[PDB]
């Protein structure tokens, strides 16, 4: 059990208990961290226009992601090597997701195997985040493992031909196959739409393009037969000076013309952030850093607590805005 | 008698004399308090365009609220359990309103009975703020008591299906029928326009919808036969990230097409704030926190002093803007 | 002779040598001082678009105010009771204006008589600032004295039916006929366009309306046969929350359609401020507080130094913007 | 070899090792330094819209400046008297440019002769920055020396009829022919388009107009047969309150209608700044202060390190934005 009542409290506690180099690795954005600040600031510029007297006695937060039911439109995003935050790492995370009835996106650079996570969370909704590695044999092996171990989708990260320049990591230096050296050597900078065609042919699993920021790229992902877009700037860790994901979301929703689900990550810290993303047409949002702060506090119980805080904040935001369920969250609730 | 010459001085004095938990309860907004800051910041963005050489020798501040004459378009808003600020609580407040010739809105969660307040301020203009409680029998009893004890209107609060998440109250924990537990258990989250129809049938008293932020909700309140709209975000204590009330006011005034009076609360601290609200079409404004700071300073004399400061600031703002009376305050005085 | 090289240096020195109550009286704006900050901030939002390769070898700063030649479009504005800043007060100021070849506007609430100032600066361009006092006999006497003693215009202040609420003056409490009490008792709040008609009939001297912020009021001043508009918010000391004078200037210039000269005061501290005001169509600007800071430093020599700093800054701003004289300063030099 | 990993680190190190008066001379902008702050802030307002899945395995940074190949669109701008920063001054700078395969613009107020710099960097791409001095004989001699010693262009500075007012230089006081006195006496304030005609007739070398901020001036430079425009506010050291160069660039690119190359300097500190300038139509950018900070750290090795940091940041920005070469950097990558 100190008393942590919002996501910011979990971050402040994590700073107090993590070694500075580990806290800095988790916290940091690219270069001058303009986008890191904007992912949060942009949510505040979108104002809520709540409806009164709707009857919100029995708020229902449940929705579906790529045809699978979830308890809430708030899911765990991929964050590499969770065992740095807590000894149980990804196993703690999947156990919390199982408890909450939400989905976990497992990093393909995890400190737990695809099989181990599936064995720890057999009833959990689980997706695999994938890089198309220079080694296409190990890429293929991960997708086959995901299929065999009951994972329900592939999130292919498309914004990382190279790793971003996070200054604190350079100052501090530095389980399915840790230093930026070895990761940089593994990731293929040549990845093209031809490689998306190869991945689409490799699996019948739903594939989501993670890291799209342009309407024209979203349209190309639909044309390649992908099943969703995760509007993401990689938590502002790749190219600094890109827009906030909440500011780009409306463009992407407009561009895909309802053909695939659109998701958002980047800067989600509060229930009102979730409400604004759904009002602008996202099906669900993903959280990265909040999950790591949960792990740092108390492993599985810490992740469960973070997810329960976001769930309760989202329920209250829905109720106060006059929304009894996610289907009645509409564009007129928000204006910038 | 320290020397307090503006409303901010009263707040700073209240911080110095109140226990931190009580000051924090009064001061706080919801969650990250974005709207709390914006209720004040938004007034500064509206600029005044004063007329010169009008003859403002005999400035007349008097107006009417729902057909009842008042000395100034500045009235006391509902604030629960005033006896926390001063031993005399609501009785101090109503005695000050009687002295000033303005109206008092009594919280239905007051530390003085409807009868006690009416006995302390028999000549005061008095209104009852109402929640539609899960217990409709006690709701009915309050309205009947208001009628019998010479209250002139019902302000039905419509923005509180649940209580907002004020973080300091969670950190500090915690007379007509005190802990958020007991209040949360009393308030009905199922309240709908059907319950407004029931209230409209229950009383011939004028009814004002308190907490409307959307033009479409304002139009529905007119269609239900209500007699006014109080444009309010509950002092930024309910849903955080809603607009400032002064920014929403023009939309609501436009939407009701002169069919009912429109009032404002939220962030009123200065005479120029009152002038801007009337220029944008509000009939009168309500003050919440300033009254509590008055009580904390010196009970009845403190409330009288706060109200006299706002009156004098408003008279000077009117005179310097070329307005001899409230009927000549027009839209051309302000631009954002 | 410390080394003061810009107007801000003179203010910082004045703070160091004046009693706090006197510094605060000079520095202060009305209420929360929003307009005080904006008079300066607004100049920074107007950006300069300099022309290159014009030939600025022999920059000529000279212009005319109401038909009288001046060395530069930078004149001394009225500031009451200059003897608080320096023993020589208004006599020091007029001697500096005589040296510079610019005009002095004498406050009608001066610590030197109209005759004394005329005797100290017989060759100086001198104007009288006038309030229409409740006592019209003493108002008439001031205008007749101005005429007899070789003053070239009347600036009638029209934004002061009452004195503004400057909070520091209230905290600190407190020669042609000192406490706000006595000044408040002297100034007529009934002044109307009828009183402007009376003043226009009283003198053939040029009359400038000082304190106009609306185009419609500027047009009425032209219709009443006045000879100029001084766009002024009284150094942000009257109604707080009015716009910056530089932001209102274009509206007023447009409204008078070239029929009378338009002047500006409020926030002029730098040569680029003068250039921006002339680019937006002002004939000349007036400085209030900078002159008091000059007096506080070294009386006549201090005022001369402040005026010489503004002159040199303005010459450099003209030269770097490609303007050899004031007639070639045009609207295309600035954009907001 | 402290560990400096970005340009800001080099500045902070230079502040620690340079005498305050020298650091202040290098750092300072004109007057209140509004433009100094805006040259940097303006880059942050331009947001990047990266393309994904392009194949950026073999990023090629090479381009051409005025027909000469360079390794990257990042060149060294003219900064007077580099020997104040390091004993080797301009010879250190040209040796670093030779190593990098980029161009050096040599100040005509250098602490090394045109011949000495050419002898130190015989293989380096070298340009001469020129003032048209009151002494046209020495102006002619510099151009003839540039021609003879294998310099490939003249950058004629057109924004300096007089030197800007940098306040710190006034507080601190103070090799082809040091005090502002002697420089002020040398520079001709009469320079006109007639003098540009004279310079165009004097040399067949390409001539770039350095310091243009207006589209109409850019068009006149094209009409006079000049070969490029360097959009520059002289590192915010001349007229304060001009726009940021990145904000003026689109106007200038539009105005010249592809007739000549357009370059930018002012506020370039990061690879994303270079990318934004090229996306808005600049051929290349110049850096001033970063080179001086390199010299202050470790002479030639320090300049090489600064240039290598900008090169690597630019390569990563190109790769993450989906640009394999400079020819595919287009207007759709940026929005303000
Ligand atoms: C420490 C850390 C590790 C991450 N690792 C990965 C990863 O392995 N794969 C991936 O696609 N994204 C990764 N991301 C990006 C996240 O999936 C996600 O886009 C981001 O955290 C969302 O922003 P938020 O942290 O503001 O919630 C990582 C982010 C962080 C902070
Ligand atoms: C301490 C406190 C108690 C309040 N209690 C009530 C209440 O019982 N009923 C109600 O309708 N509104 C209540 N409000 C909201 C106020 O009526 C009013 O909308 C708000 O205070 C106006 O904003 P201001 O405080 O900035 O003037 C309360 C506000 C505060 C700060
Ligand atoms: C201390 C002080 C005294 C003033 N006295 C007068 C006055 O007697 N009459 C008047 O018309 N304006 C008066 N003003 C307003 C000034 O004439 C002028 O509008 C203002 O100072 C311009 O702004 P600035 O101080 O930013 O230059 C006064 C201003 C100050 C600061
Ligand atoms: C210390 C210093 C000396 C300079 N000397 C010259 C010069 O001799 N000639 C010239 O044309 N520009 C000169 N400049 C302006 C630069 O060429 C260039 O426009 C400016 O430094 C670009 O901005 P940045 O410093 O933000 O990169 C100088 C700038 C600085 C900071
Ligand atoms: C003091 N620490 C822990 C430290 N300093 O630098 C590093 C570090 C540097 C590079 C890579 C890793 C871990 N592996 C991966 C693998 C794939 C990824 N995709 N996105 C990210 C991301 O961090 O945004 C990824 C990280 C690191 O842990 N760690
Ligand atoms: C340390 N104190 C005094 C503390 N901490 O938490 C609480 C508290 C929490 C919940 C409720 C109350 C009081 N009752 C009500 C009743 C109706 C209301 N309508 N609006 C409000 C509001 O506060 O905005 C209302 C408050 C409280 O006093 N008090
Ligand atoms: C500690 N001091 C010096 C102090 N505190 O309060 C006061 C004071 C208060 C009221 C009036 C005066 C002086 N008389 C006038 C007369 C006409 C004016 N027109 N504009 C102004 C202005 O100040 O903006 C005027 C001031 C004061 O000096 N002085
Ligand atoms: C403590 N130092 C070094 C100091 N204080 O003032 C000065 C100084 C003042 C004036 C001139 C110089 C050097 N000569 C030149 C020559 C041509 C130039 N073109 N642009 C600039 C610029 O600085 O922006 C130029 C500077 C100075 O070094 N130096």
Pair C112, C90: CB distance under 8 Å = yes
CA–chain centroid gap for A104, Å, is 9
Q: Which residue has the tokens 């912020």?
A: C213
Q: Do A239 and D317 touch (CB under 8 A)?
A: yes
* A225 among annotated binding-site residues: no
Considering only CB atoms, A242 lies closest to which of D43, D48, D319, namely D48
Q: What is the rounded CA–CA span in Å between residue B294 and residue B92? A: 10
Mutation pick for ligand 7 pocket among C27, C182, C183 (CB with most ligand atoms within 8 Å): C183
Put residue D185 in one of left, alpha, beta given phi > 0 → left and psi -120 to 50 → alpha. Answer: alpha
Nearest to C47 by CA among D136, D243, B313: D243
Nearest to A35 by CA among A272, A242, A292, A334: A242
Residues of A assigned a catalytic role: 234
Q: Kindly report the CA angle at B176 between B170 and B182, in degrees rounded to 5? A: 25
Say if strands A261-265 and C261-265 run parallel, antiparallel, or are unpaired: unpaired
In the DSSP assignment, the letter for residue B280 is: T
Say if strands A47-48 and A334-335 run parallel, antiparallel, or are unpaired: antiparallel
Q: What is the rounded CA–CA span in Å between residue A298 and residue A306? A: 10
Pair A313, A109: CB distance under 8 Å = no
Pair C31, C296: CB distance under 8 Å = no
Nearest to D323 by CA among D45, D44, D57: D57
Q: Kindly report the CA angle at D221 between D220 and D226, in degrees rounded to 5? A: 145
Considering only CB atoms, B239 lies closest to which of A50, A54, A57, namely A50
Burial class of D170 by CB neighbour count within 10 A (0 to 12, 13 to 18, 19+): middle
CA of B29 to the centre of ligand 3 (A): 40
Nearest to C217 by CA among C188, C242, C185, C240: C242
Neighbours of chain A (3+ CB pairs under 8 A): B, D
Please, which residues have CB within 8 angstroms of residue C271's CB and are 6 or more apart in sequence? C310, C312, C313, C314, C315, C316, C317, C318
Q: What is the rounded CA–CA span in Å between residue C333 and residue C48? A: 6
**Alpha-carbon dihedral sign for residues D166, D167, D169, D173:** positive
Q: What is the rounded CA–CA span in Å between residue B239 and residue B34? A: 10
Pair C213, C207: CB distance under 8 Å = no
C185 touches chain B (CB under 8 A): no
Ligand nearest to the CA of D35: 4
Pair C27, C290: CB distance under 8 Å = no
Tokens coding A86: 């807590």
C240 touches chain B (CB under 8 A): yes
What are the φ/ψ torsions at residue B303 (nearest 5 degrees)?
-65, -45
Instruction: Say if ligand 7 is within 6 A of residue C237 CB.
Output: yes
Pair D268, D245: CB distance under 8 Å = no
Say if strands B63-65 and C47-48 run parallel, antiparallel, or are unpaired: unpaired
Q: Do A242 and D50 touch (CB under 8 A)?
A: yes
Q: Kindly report the CA angle at C315 between C309 and C317, in degrees rounded to 5? A: 100
Method: X-ray
Q: Which residue has the tokens 């020397």?
A: B3
**Alpha-carbon dihedral sign for residues D108, D110, D116, D119:** negative
- Residue nearest to ligand 2 atom 15, measured at CA: B234
Q: Where are the beta strands (DSSP E) in chain C?
A: 47-48, 63-65, 68-70, 74-76, 103-106, 125-130, 154-157, 207-212, 228-231, 261-265, 284-287, 334-335
What CA–CA distances, in Å, run from B320 to B324, C158, D172?
10, 10, 47
Please, which residues have CB within 8 angstroms of residue A177's CB and are 6 or more apart in sequence? A138
C211 touches chain B (CB under 8 A): yes
* D232 among annotated binding-site residues: yes
What distance in Å separates residue C161's CA from the closest CA in chain B? Answer: 7
* D289 among annotated binding-site residues: yes
Q: What is the rounded CA–CA span in Å between residue D60 and residue D67? A: 18
CB atoms within 10 A of CB A185: 10
C190 touches chain B (CB under 8 A): yes
Pair A284, A263: CB distance under 8 Å = yes
Q: Do B162 and A50 touch (CB under 8 A)?
A: no
In the DSSP assignment, the letter for residue D331 is: G
Q: Do D167 and C5 touch (CB under 8 A)?
A: yes
Q: How many CA atoms lie within 13 Å of B77's alpha carbon, on the beta-carbon side?
A: 26
CA–chain centroid gap for A171, Å, is 27
CA of A105 to the centre of ligand 1 (A): 10
Q: What is the rounded CA–CA span in Å between residue D57 and residue D324? A: 8
Chain A residues with CB under 8 Å of D54 CB are 192
Instruction: Say if ligand 8 is within 6 A of residue D167 CB.
Output: no
Please, which residues have CB within 8 angstroms of residue B216's CB and are 6 or more apart in sequence? A51, B255
Q: Which neighbouring-strand residues pair with A69?
A: A64
Instruction: Say if ligand 7 is within 6 A of residue C269 CB.
Output: no
Q: What is the rounded CA–CA span in Å between residue D299 and residue D95? A: 10
Chain C residues with CB under 8 Å of B57 CB are 161, 188-190
Q: Where are the beta strands (DSSP E) in C201-304?
A: 207-212, 228-231, 261-265, 284-287
* B294 among annotated binding-site residues: no
**What distance separates the 2 farthest-apart alpha carbons in chain A?**
58
C6 touches chain D (CB under 8 A): yes
D191 touches chain C (CB under 8 A): yes
Q: Which residue has the tokens 């700071």?
A: B293
Nearest to C101 by CA among C290, C283, C308, C261: C308
Pair C164, C113: CB distance under 8 Å = no
Tokens coding C97: 């204006």
Chain A residues with CB under 8 Å of D5 CB are 167, 170-171
What are the φ/ψ torsions at residue C58 (nearest 5 degrees)?
-125, 60
End-to-end CA distance of chain A: 39
Q: What is the rounded CA–CA span in Å between residue B334 and residue B317? A: 13
**What distance separates the 2 farthest-apart alpha carbons in chain C?**
58
Q: Do A159 and D320 touch (CB under 8 A)?
A: yes
Pair B47, B335: CB distance under 8 Å = yes
Residue of A nearest to D9 (CA): A167
D1 touches chain A (CB under 8 A): no
CA of D260 to the centre of ligand 1 (A): 44
Pair C223, C245: CB distance under 8 Å = no
Q: Kindly report the CA angle at D237 between D233 and D243, in degrees rounded to 5? A: 40
| DSSP assignments along A209-236, one per residue | EEEE--HHHHHHHHHTT--EEEE--GGG
Please, which residues have CB within 8 angstroms of residue B193's CB and are 6 or more apart in sequence? A53, B220, B224
Instruction: Say if ligand 8 is within 6 A of residue D84 CB.
Output: yes
Tokens coding A14: 């994590």
- Residue nearest to ligand 6 atom 10, measured at CA: B180
Q: What is the rounded CA–CA span in Å between residue B102 and residue B115? A: 19
CA of B157 to the centre of ligand 6 (A): 15
| Helix, strand, coil percentages for chain A (3-state, nearest 5) | 50, 15, 35
In the DSSP assignment, the letter for residue D179 is: -
End-to-end CA distance of chain C: 39
Q: Do A195 and D57 touch (CB under 8 A)?
A: no
| DSSP assignments along D204-272, one per residue | -S-EEEEEE--HHHHHHHHHTT--EEEE--GGGTSSTTPPPHHHHHHHHHHHHTTSSEEEEESS--SHH
Q: How many CA atoms lie within 13 Å of C11's alpha carbon, on the beta-carbon side?
A: 12
Q: Which residue has the tokens 């009628």?
A: B147
What distance in Å separates residue A223's CA from the closest CA in chain D? Answer: 14
* B237 among annotated binding-site residues: yes
| Helix, strand, coil percentages for chain B (3-state, nearest 5) | 50, 15, 35
Tell me how many helices (H) and strands (E) chain B has: 13, 12
Say if strands D284-287 and D334-335 run parallel, antiparallel, or are unpaired: unpaired
For the stretch D250-259, contacts whose Cβ atoms lie closer than 8 Å and that sit 24 or more positions apart, written own/partner, are D250/D280, D250/D281, D251/D214, D251/D215, D252/D212, D252/D213, D252/D215, D252/D218, D253/D280, D253/D281, D253/D282, D254/D215, D255/D215, D255/D216, D255/D218, D255/D219, D256/D218, D256/D219, D256/D222, D256/D229, D259/D222
Q: What is the rounded CA–CA span in Å between residue C195 and residue B135? A: 65
Nearest to B160 by CA among B130, B119, B126, B200: B130
Q: What is the rounded CA–CA span in Å between residue A30 and residue D317? A: 11
D316 touches chain A (CB under 8 A): yes
Chain C residues with CB under 8 Å of D168 CB are none
CB atoms within 10 A of CB D21: 14
Tokens coding C34: 């929003």
Say if strands C47-48 and C334-335 run parallel, antiparallel, or are unpaired: antiparallel
**Rg of chain B over CA atoms, in angstroms?**
19
CB atoms within 10 A of CB C205: 17
Pair C291, C269: CB distance under 8 Å = no
Residue of B nearest to C234 (CA): B320
CB atoms within 10 A of CB A225: 12
Q: Which residue has the tokens 């400038």?
A: C208
- Residue nearest to ligand 3 atom 6, measured at CA: C79
Torsion, Cα D41 D45 D51 D52, to 10 degrees, reads 70
Nearest to D211 by CA among D292, D266, D174: D266
Which of C13, C86, C224, C234 is catalytic? The answer is C234
End-to-end CA distance of chain D: 39
Q: What is the rounded CA–CA span in Å between residue C17 and residue A68? A: 75
What atom of ligand 6 comes closest to residue B109's alpha carbon?
16
Q: What is the rounded CA–CA span in Å between residue D116 and residue D149? A: 10
Chain C residues with CB under 8 Å of D188 CB are 57
Q: Which neighbouring-strand residues pair with D157?
A: D210
A178 touches chain D (CB under 8 A): no
Q: Which residues line ligand 3 (CB under 6 A)?
A: C 26, 39, 77-80, 107, 109, 129, 157, 210, 232, 234-235, 237, 265-268, 287-289
Q: Which neighbouring-strand residues pair with D208?
A: D155, D228
What distance in Å separates residue D119's CA from the closest CA in chain A? Answer: 38
Question: Which domains are present in chain C?
Answer: 7-335 (3.20.20.70)
| DSSP assignments along C151-211, one per residue | ---EEEE-S-SS----HHHHHH-------HHHHHHHB-TT-BHHHHHHHHHH--S-EEEEE
């Amino acid at each position: 059990m100190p008393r942590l009542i919002c996501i910011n409290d979990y971050e402040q506690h994590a700073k107090s208990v993590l070694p500075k180099s580990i806290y800095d690795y988790y916290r940091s954005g690219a270069n001058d961290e303009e986008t890191l600040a904007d992912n949060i600031a942009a949510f505040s510029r979108w104002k809520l226009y709540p409806r009164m007297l709707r009857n919100v006695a029995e708020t229902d937060l449940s929705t579906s992601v790529l045809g699978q039911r979830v308890s809430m439109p708030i899911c765990v995003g991929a964050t590499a090597m969770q065992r740095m935050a807590h000894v149980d790492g990804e196993l703690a995370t999947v156990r919390a997701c199982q408890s909450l009835g939400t989905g976990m996106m497992l990093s393909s650079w995890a400190t737990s195997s695809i099989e181990e996570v599936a064995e720890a969370g057999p009833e959990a909704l689980r997706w695999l985040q994938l890089y198309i590695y220079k080694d296409r044999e190990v890429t293929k092996k991960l997708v086959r493992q995901a299929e065999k171990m009951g994972y329900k989708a592939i999130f292919v990260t498309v914004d990382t031909p190279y790793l971003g320049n996070r200054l604190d990591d350079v100052r501090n230096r530095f389980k399915n196959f840790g230093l930026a050296a070895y990761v940089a050597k593994a990731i293929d900078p040549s990845i093209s739409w031809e490689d998306i065609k190869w991945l689409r042919r490799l699996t019948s699993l739903p594939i989501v393009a993670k890291g799209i920021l342009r309407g024209d790229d979203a349209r190309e992902a639909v044309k390649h037969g992908l099943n969703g877009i995760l509007v993401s700037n990689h938590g502002a860790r790749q190219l600094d000076g890109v827009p906030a994901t909440i500011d780009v979301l409306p463009e992407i929703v407009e561009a895909v013309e309802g053909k695939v689900e659109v998701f958002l990550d980047g800067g989600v810290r509060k229930g009102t952030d979730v409400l604004k993303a759904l009002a602008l047409g996202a099906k669900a949002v993903f959280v990265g850093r909040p999950i790591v702060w949960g792990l740092a506090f108390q492993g599985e119980k810490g992740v469960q607590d973070v997810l329960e805080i976001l769930k309760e904040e989202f329920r209250l935001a829905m109720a106060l805005s006059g929304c009894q369920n996610v289907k009645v969250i509409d564009k007129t609730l928000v204006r910038k």
